Amino acid sequence: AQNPNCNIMIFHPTKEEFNDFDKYIAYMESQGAHRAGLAKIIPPKEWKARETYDNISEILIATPLQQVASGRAGVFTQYHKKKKAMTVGEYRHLANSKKYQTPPHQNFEDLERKYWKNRIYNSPIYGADISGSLFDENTKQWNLGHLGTIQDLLEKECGVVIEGVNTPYLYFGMWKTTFAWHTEDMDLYSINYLHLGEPKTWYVVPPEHGQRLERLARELFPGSSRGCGAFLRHKVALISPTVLKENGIPFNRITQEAGEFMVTFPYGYHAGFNHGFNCAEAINFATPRWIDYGKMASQCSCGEARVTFSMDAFVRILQPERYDLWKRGQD
């Protein structure tokens, strides 16, 4: 069995190997990458996402989210307070302001310490889930807006024909902006490219141990657990590495830098935070190996998780028994 300790693997594809996306995902899996839940892909030196970023301040963040925490430093939830629209230029200036900027620090480890110590005492503002792409249309390799769609994968594998589309999203982060512990919708893969700016630290639980994390989460958030049998779908709960280690939950950590891709694998729980102003792009995708995870994915039916249009068909086809209840939670 490859990668039995479920370590995060880092890949350095050549330009030739970067041509065929699906093939390279399958390659990484042949080496056991998926067992970690997360992999890093460093593009060949000859590749570029786009020529420059010199013109990104005009993008609009229609609904910036202030991430307000409740709990204790290592175990907290966050809610998103909607703020008034702002441009990327406005947001970048805010990120760099004394109130929100990254503190002095020695190295990534010191900064991680400061994050876990102090996150809860601040409410950073996140520009998340903005439909769009910053890849140049002429970038042919690993262009997140030119991937094969999840609908087409399900059609190819299963023969059914469904509505729905699959487009990328932009994320504009600042110091302490936080992504809570989650898997993807329908336990899909995700791919994330850090276009520019400061790093993003990731934590991940191996898919084969995801239920260990869920059990701890039920213990740590007992009211939330009573409200919903899949409340990590709400994407609001944080648990620190110290707490995970105290409770024997297997995990790994890695820091993604600008110019790097990360892939999350089906049912790989992940969480993390941004080091300072940055911009990432991400999208869900599927492979044949996903289909079995899609069929088994938990679902939130309490109404909190509310998701895209395109998830309807996935539930309807892969989880017909669950469809009626889940759709009530959508409606």
Ligand SMILES: O=C(O)CNC(=O)C(=O)O
């Ligand atoms: O970048 C972020 O804030 C969150 N991204 C993801 O959870 C992902 O790419 O799957």
Ligand SMILES: [Mg+2]
């Ligand atoms: Mg612009």
Ligand code: NI
């Ligand atoms: Ni994710």
Ligand SMILES: [Zn+2]
């Ligand atoms: Zn729920």
